[PDB]
Design a binder for these strands. Structure first.
Lengths: 94, 38, 131, 141, 136, 176
RNA sequence: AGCCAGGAUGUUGGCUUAGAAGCAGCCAUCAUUUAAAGAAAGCGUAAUAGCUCACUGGUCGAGUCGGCCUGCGCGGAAGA
């Protein structure tokens, strides 16, 4: 049971992503199905402990935002080239 | 004693001490392991 | 050493024979060389075999937590090392007398070789045992 | 017996007396000569098997008198005369030469238990099983 | 001594070492030695780090070499004035960006692979770190 | 910290005066006075002595652990006293004490005479043995080190001034 | 972590038997007595011996231990 506390993104782009990622909060996005893609913003250290388990990329995740229980699955991850940290995770809505 | 710029513990009796700002290795068993720098 | 769970399987194995035993005895080895293992521990194989638990976990809360199940006067043994001993073969057998005649057998210190239950009292070298 | 000050474990190859080439000055170091060593052991040679490498614990006292209690020959040589092979380990991970049964070894392991530190006889025959496959021997069952 | 066979051209420009690496993950094996620093690894440096690494664990195991030099480096001889054409090719280096996996190892315990990557990192000029194969 | 939070008990008959940061302890064996660093907080207020970190100083707990052990030695020294036992290993290595001066023959070309400090009593029941007594553990430790520094224990035969509770590693000449 | 103990039985385990006996190295990498003890980590023996350590008993009394990401620091750092 991987529950992630996340927020909706208000800004985007190169400058916006680097600003919020430097605040220990790397961005992501939830897409899939037929709804519009939801650019999401979430804390880095919380997911960094959960993503170290092998079951993080195989079970269905429940990312909560605005009180909404969204059944989501991890599609792809953009890790840092040389640092033990994440930059962006692609979340497929399953 | 060795004046190697990279000192380490060479056995279980080696102990690291920072005497007067200089980091030294003190071994009770082997006097050869005694060294200081870095 | 591992978690508390493997420290409780020693509590489970200890309590598993507390409610069926008759007598309880105390012996100590603070000078005990493996010649005591030669004599005292092989003395258990003379009677029945392996399972005479002579375990020593008599901390103030380690062996005391397994005491309130049965024979509740073992809670305050504390220091002065205690090796528990139970007597399954024969009702009121002579393992307490087995240590009473072992006072000249490398047993200078034995936590005063007290013994623990049947009269619910203290140190007394009993002689009213069935033969 | 006393605490160790002068006594050691000796007697390699007790088939012949006075093991001066194998052991030598080990008992001659502290206080014990080799001449009287065969005198006290002469009552224990022909009472047991002759030609077997049996060890003995030489007990040294401070009054020129020495006693001895003979122990059981090891599993290193009791598996040689039982299986019928004059060999040993050599390289235990590459060859297995011995063909000895468990019942063939426990009938003399009950003689081993008179000096071994066990409770049950069959609870200690598995200890000789631990020496069995360490030498290139399989215990058939 | 890694060296390409029958390349198109003998000499090539110096170039620049900018941007990030591409092979940033452990693909073939299970343990890797990801480079953190930025520099050039010569043919000697790669081979010297290889000898100190394949001897560290045992003769067992499989080791992958993710990096190949594929770039000639010229060097003017002593007492030669500037100009008079390009110098002669002496050795071959490999441009390494921060995050490049240099070696990949598999079939060994993690503790044993930790020491091999520590000994190989001493021969390398740039700073490297121990990385593992992450799932997906 | 763990040493600083363990109070030393002062016995009966020996009085401890708190002269601010200066502490004097008087006993039947002698009287030791010592001033401490300002980082400690000493309050007698009992039949024991307690310690604590004075405010402002960050290393008060580390200083109080040192001050606890010092005053612990100042209690044992004035009630029982400290004693160091030496040994003179070597041929012709004699020792003699003349009131307060210790004469040593350590194979030199001249006799060496060490002068004992005030309150330090040394006896020589054996010519190859020196027993010295005092009230301060630190002072008699320096005296024992000074006597050992004249002729240190040889790492080949153990020759030299050594402590009775000292072990000496001996090496060989590698061929003969 | 300290303060008081064990640290065993076989087992000289075989190999060139000069002996490798827990401790040059080849190998299985055992089983029991079991509060616990590895046929063994160091010093020490030609080989034994011995001093200990792991692991386990008691006292004690609370946090301690081993990595990671980093700010500011130390050494490396010797010239007229």
């Amino acid at each position: 049971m991987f529950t992630i506390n996340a927020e909706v993104r208000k800004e985007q782009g190169k400058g916006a992503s680097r600003r919020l990622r430097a605040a220990n909060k790397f961005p992501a996005i939830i897409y899939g199905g037929k709804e519009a893609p939801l650019a999401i913003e979430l804390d880095h250290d919380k997911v960094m402990n959960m993503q170290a388990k092998a079951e993080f990329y195989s079970e269905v995740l429940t990312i909560v935002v605005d009180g909404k229980e969204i059944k989501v699955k991890a599609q792809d991850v953009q890790r840092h080239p040389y640092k033990p940290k994440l930059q962006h995770i692609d979340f497929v809505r399953a | 004693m060795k004046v190697r710029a990279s000192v380490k513990k060479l056995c279980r009796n080696c102990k690291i001490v920072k005497r007067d700002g200089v980091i030294r290795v003190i071994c009770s068993a082997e006097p050869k392991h005694k060294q200081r720098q870095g | 050493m591992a978690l508390n769970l493997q420290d409780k399987q020693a509590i489970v194995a200890e309590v598993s024979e507390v409610a069926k035993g008759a007598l309880s005895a105390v012996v100590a080895d603070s000078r005990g060389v493996t010649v005591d293992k030669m004599t005292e521990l092989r003395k258990a194989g003379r009677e029945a075999g392996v399972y005479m638990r002579v375990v020593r976990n008599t901390l103030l809360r380690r062996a005391v937590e397994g005491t309130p199940f049965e024979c509740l006067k073992d809670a305050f043994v504390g220091p002065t090392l205690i090796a528990y001993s139970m007597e399954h073969p024969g009702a009121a057998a002579r393992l307490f007398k087995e240590f009473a005649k072992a006072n000249a057998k490398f047993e200078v210190k034995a936590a005063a070789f007290e013994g623990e239950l049947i009269p619910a009292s203290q140190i007394d070298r009993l002689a009213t045992l069935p033969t | 017996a006393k605490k160790v000050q002068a006594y050691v474990k000796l007697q390699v190859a007790a088939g012949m007396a006075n093991p001066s080439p194998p052991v030598g000055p080990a008992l001659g170091q502290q206080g014990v000569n080799i001449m009287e060593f065969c005198k006290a052991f002469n009552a224990k040679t022909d009472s047991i098997e002759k030609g077997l490498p049996i060890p003995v614990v030489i007990t040294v006292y401070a009054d020129r008198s020495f006693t001895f209690v003979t122990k059981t020959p090891p599993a290193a040589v009791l598996l040689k005369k039982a299986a019928g092979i004059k060999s040993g380990s050599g390289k235990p991970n590459k060859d297995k030469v011995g063909k000895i049964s468990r019942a063939q070894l426990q009938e003399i392991a009950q003689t081993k238990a008179a000096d071994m530190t066990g409770a049950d006889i069959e609870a200690m025959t598995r200890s000789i099983e631990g020496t069995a496959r360490s030498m290139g021997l399989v215990v058939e069952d | 001594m890694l060296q390409p066979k029958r390349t198109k051209f003998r000499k090539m420009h110096k170039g620049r070492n900018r941007g990030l690496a591409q092979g940033t993950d452990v693909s073939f094996g299970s343990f890797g030695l990801k480079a953190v620093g930025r520099g050039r690894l010569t043919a000697r440096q790669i081979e010297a780090a290889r000898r100190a690494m394949t001897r560290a664990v045992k003769r067992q195991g499989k080791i992958w070499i993710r990096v190949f030099p594929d770039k000639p480096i010229t060097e003017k001889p002593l007492a030669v004035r500037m100009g008079k054409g390009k110098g002669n090719v002496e050795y071959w280096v490999a441009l390494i960006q921060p995050g490049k996996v240099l070696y990949e190892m598999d079939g060994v315990p993690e503790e044993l692979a930790r020491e091999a990557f520590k000994l190989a990192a001493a021969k390398l000029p740039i700073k490297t770190t121990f990385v593992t194969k992450t799932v997906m | 910290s763990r040493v600083a939070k363990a109070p030393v008990v002062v016995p009966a008959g020996v009085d401890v005066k708190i002269n601010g940061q200066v502490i004097t302890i008087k006993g039947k064996n002698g009287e030791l006075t010592r001033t401490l660093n300002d980082a400690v907080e000493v309050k007698h207020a009992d039949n024991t002595l307690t310690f604590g970190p004075r405010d402002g100083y960050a290393d008060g707990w580390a200083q109080a652990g040192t001050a606890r052990a010092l005053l612990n030695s100042m209690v044992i020294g004035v009630t029982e006293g400290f004693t160091k036992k030496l040994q003179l290993v070597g041929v012709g290595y004699r020792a003699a004490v003349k009131g307060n001066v210790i004469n040593l023959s350590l194979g030199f070309s001249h006799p060496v005479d060490h002068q004992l400090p005030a309150g330090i009593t040394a006896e020589c029941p054996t010519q190859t043995e020196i027993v010295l007594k005092g009230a301060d553990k630190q002072v008699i430790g320096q005296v024992a080190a000074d006597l050992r520094a004249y002729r240190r224990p040889e790492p080949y035969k153990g020759k030299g001034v050594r402590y009775a509770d000292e072990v000496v590693r001996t090496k060989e000449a590698k061929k003969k």
